[PDB]
Ligand binder design. Structure first.
Ligand SMILES: [Cl-]
Ligand SMILES: [Cl-]
Length: 162
């Protein structure tokens, strides 16, 4: 198990524009295209992202390319963020993937807002951090996925993904 296989499990793979759990046009492995309700606006984002006139449909190779960029963007978002980087630096490799997962799902700004959970993670109070993480819109809206990520923070193992 690693961050790519982990996010692949959580995001699925779909080759045509679909709507994510919030109703936002998305494609590939969880690649958010736009929060606009215009399918046309989403298709324009897709053409721009891929670099060609798509029919709202991409290949698997293209979906994996956006995935690679997006994982890389999540890591670099963590490392540029003054609240996220110290927590990331403080974690082991498994829990680091759990943080990348949250940033991939919600963005750098959103996760950097989990101030109290971040402090408990940096303090390595895993059970407490796990309880605090669950007290969130994130947990309530995507509870099975949040449970998996939270179990990864709580245990420092991949048990939720096997
Ligand atoms: Cl992009
Ligand atoms: Cl879920």
């Amino acid at each position: 198990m690693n961050i790519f296989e982990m996010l692949r499990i959580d995001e699925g793979l779909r080759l045509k524009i679909y709507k994510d759990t919030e109703g936002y046009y998305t494609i590939g492995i969880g690649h958010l295209l736009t929060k606009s309700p215009s399918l046309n606006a989403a298709k324009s984002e897709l053409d721009k992202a891929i670099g060609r006139n798509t029919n709202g449909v991409i290949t698997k190779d293209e979906a994996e390319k956006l995935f690679n960029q997006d994982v890389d963007a999540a890591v670099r978002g963590i490392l540029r963020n003054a609240k996220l980087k110290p927590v990331y630096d403080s974690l082991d490799a498994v829990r680091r993937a759990a943080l990348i997962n949250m940033v991939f799902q919600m963005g750098e700004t959103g996760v950097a807002g989990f101030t109290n959970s971040l402090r408990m993670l940096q303090q390595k109070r895993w059970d407490e951090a796990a309880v605090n993480l669950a007290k969130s819109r994130w947990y309530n809206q995507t509870p099975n996925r949040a449970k998996r990520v939270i179990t990864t923070f709580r245990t420092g193992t991949w048990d939720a993904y096997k």
